């Protein structure tokens, strides 16, 4: 369950990233991915680091 944190900002289709996110499931992987979904507004480096 390897974690990966996906992050977007602004107008974007989250359910599409979810779509392709579930679309790919392959035993070719020797480990299962742990899919995560995240979004944010501001570009300020500090708060970016924070989240």
């Amino acid at each position: 369950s390897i974690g990966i944190a996906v992050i977007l900002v602004g107008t974007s289709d989250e359910v599409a990233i979810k779509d392709a996110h579930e679309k790919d499931d392959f035993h070719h992987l020797s480990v299962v991915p742990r899919v995560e979904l995240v979004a944010m507004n501001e570009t300020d480096p500090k708060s970016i680091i924070t989240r």
Partner: protein, 41 residues
Amino acid sequence: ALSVCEDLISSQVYAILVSHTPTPVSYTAGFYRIPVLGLTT
């Protein structure tokens, strides 16, 4: 950098002083383009 924003930048700061890579400080100042002079580096 966290304490630079919260503690420092929030104070409407013209300059900062640094000693000891301390480089992150400059990263912050630079995203703010704010001149800062330390000592020891």
